[PDB]
């Protein structure tokens, strides 16, 4: 009875050991939190992973129908058992039923689903690249010289600073189109309209596949994505980028920089100033790192430090 179960718990603990050194099979970003409890029937008691909404998990293997093996992408965190989407759904359902059981008959009805309202189902996990692609936004719009040059200086810095550990590539499709819901069912989102779009969804899909593949061996991935000027353009995709905001805090400074480029750039001052203002209006949490340093070496050092910390989070020594 309890010897069979001491045993099958030894098989699972052996598989968990072995998983420390497997490659990352795939990564997810969660849409739900999970607090394990003993009744969850974790294959090794006490070794489920706790996580919150929007955490990142690297998955080594699917252990069985109910459990995966992997780790939170965070320094010090080691592999453990992670509930599969199936298991999370079964636990969620039990949690709703147990809520009804514990309810007080003195309670009144809940606030109603308002009639006819359409909701997209959100799965507990979204598959994301195993290394979050680094995308630069700011100080103003891409395709103008102040922004393009300042961004180029930073990727040039990264190319040498993380040589042997990084891929830097230009994205050839408008990746803002890669909405999780559109990519997951393209025929459900056909909209007949007149628009200035330049990429097909097939092209966008090939690009997303290429990005995932660059990240599979856990090298840093940086993208020159020229259509992406604002983090909201990617927040509904399953790219989960690291958004790096190059921030010129003083718009008077930006105006003078644009003017330094000559009349052919400063005739577009207004559009560039407006874009810079929009980034400055953004809640700071839509950025992963804000570089507001006025020296290139200083902005570089800050970004490199962040990326070294991200390297540590993605490459544990037990790997």
């Amino acid at each position: 009875r309890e010897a069979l179960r001491k045993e099958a718990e030894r098989q699972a603990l052996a598989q968990l050991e072995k998983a420390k050194t497997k490659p990352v099979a795939f990564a997810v970003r969660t849409n739900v939190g999970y607090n394990p409890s003993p009744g969850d029937e974790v294959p090794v008691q006490g070794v489920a992973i706790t996580f919150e909404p929007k955490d990142f998990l690297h998955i080594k293997e699917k252990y069985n129908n109910d459990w995966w093996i992997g780790r939170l992408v965070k320094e010090g965190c080691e592999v453990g058992f992670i509930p599969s989407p199936v298991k999370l759904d079964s636990l969620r359902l039990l949690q709703e039923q147990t809520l009804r059981q514990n309810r007080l008959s003195s309670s009144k009805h809940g606030k109603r689903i308002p009639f006819f309202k359409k909701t997209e189902h959100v799965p507990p996990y979204d598959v994301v690249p195993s290394m979050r692609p680094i995308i630069l936004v700011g100080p103003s719009l891409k395709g103008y010289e102040v922004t393009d040059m300042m961004q180029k200086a930073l990727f040039d810095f990264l190319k040498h600073r993380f040589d042997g550990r990084i891929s830097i590539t230009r994205v050839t499709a408008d990746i803002s189109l890669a909405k999780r819901s559109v990519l997951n069912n393209p025929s459900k989102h056909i909209i007949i309209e007149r628009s200035n779009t330049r990429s097909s969804l097939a092209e966008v899909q090939s690009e997303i596949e290429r990005i995932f593949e660059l990240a599979r061996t856990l090298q840093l991935v940086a993208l020159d994505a020229d259509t992406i000027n604002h983090p909201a353009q990617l927040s509904k995709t399953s790219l989960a980028p690291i958004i790096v905001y190059i921030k010129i805090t003083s718009p008077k400074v930006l105006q003078r920089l644009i003017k330094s480029r000559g009349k052919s750039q400063s005739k577009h001052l207004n559009v560039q100033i407006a874009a810079s203002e929009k980034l400055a209006q953004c809640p700071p949490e839509m950025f992963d790192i804000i570089l507001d340093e006025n020296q290139l070496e200083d902005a570089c050092e800050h970004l490199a430090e962040y990326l070294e910390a991200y390297w540590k989070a993605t490459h544990p020594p037990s790997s």
Binding site: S250, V253, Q295, L296
Partner: peptide, 18 residues
């Protein structure tokens, strides 16, 4: 004084992006 320093630093940054 900060404007002047910002301009000098960011102008240098731009050149390095050439």
């Amino acid at each position: 004084q900060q404007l002047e320093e910002d301009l000098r630093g960011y102008m240098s940054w731009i050149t390095q992006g050439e």
